[PDB]
Homo-oligomer: A and B are copies of this chain.
């Protein structure tokens, strides 16, 4: 009945503007894993949709003072969008305010190092300072450390807040560039699937090391109580059971791997 407003965020390889986007229009201007996923969900559910980019460039958190939700979660909470399709982590605080489909992708926080860096685990990082390490300055990865009550991760958080120069980065691109240019003196903590994607990108100078720090999942989000939630969740399960989600990851991660 009404075109579905999808909120998403520019982040390779999930959503990217095509090289020739200036000659294109509407949803066709974009490409990537989430662009393909959105089309698949829309096809299965039978709805038309419009891809829009989240205004504040955030995933979703609530300001402790104003109690206002930002990011894509906020767009859903305040009715600015009907669905969020992005690498959005399912978390308890977000679950309380919006609906989430079952996971369409599994991941965990992981360590990205420049090849040759003498680090094999989070415990290794926590015990030293010569090799700096940090996370994005917004998002679930940062929140994991900030809220952790596990000794090793809490120590890492205390290290991150007090380390100089700042170990935080504004974007994935910045984090990756920092690892690449720091001669092994910076390790980036990020979600495993992003680590995996970057490991297959030229100059092929990074790698994922150690096991993941946690086990989470990305889910499609809708406003709490939205009648679209049920259908979208069944669509995700259908796509997974058909093997289409695995094919989608292979397409954007490995089929054209550069290493």
Partner of A103, one of B103, B241, B246: B103
A219 to B100, CA, bound (A): 14
Within 8 A of B (CB), among A46-91: 90-91
Across the interface, which residues of B come within 8 angstroms of A243, CB to CB?
150, 214
Across the interface, which residues of B come within 8 angstroms of A90, CB to CB?
102, 237
Across the interface, which residues of B come within 8 angstroms of A215, CB to CB?
106, 240, 245-246
**Does A242 count as interface, using CB distance less than 8 angstroms?**
yes
A233 to B147, CA, bound (A): 20
Chain A interface mostly: mixed
Across the interface, which residues of B come within 8 angstroms of A92, CB to CB?
234, 237-238, 241
Across the interface, which residues of B come within 8 angstroms of A246, CB to CB?
214-215
Partner of A95, one of B103, B150, B237: B237
Within 8 A of B (CB), among A214-254: 214-217, 219, 233-234, 237-238, 240-243, 245-246
Residues of A within 8 A of B (CB): 90-92, 95-96, 100, 102-103, 106, 147, 149-150, 214-217, 219, 233-234, 237-238, 240-243, 245-246
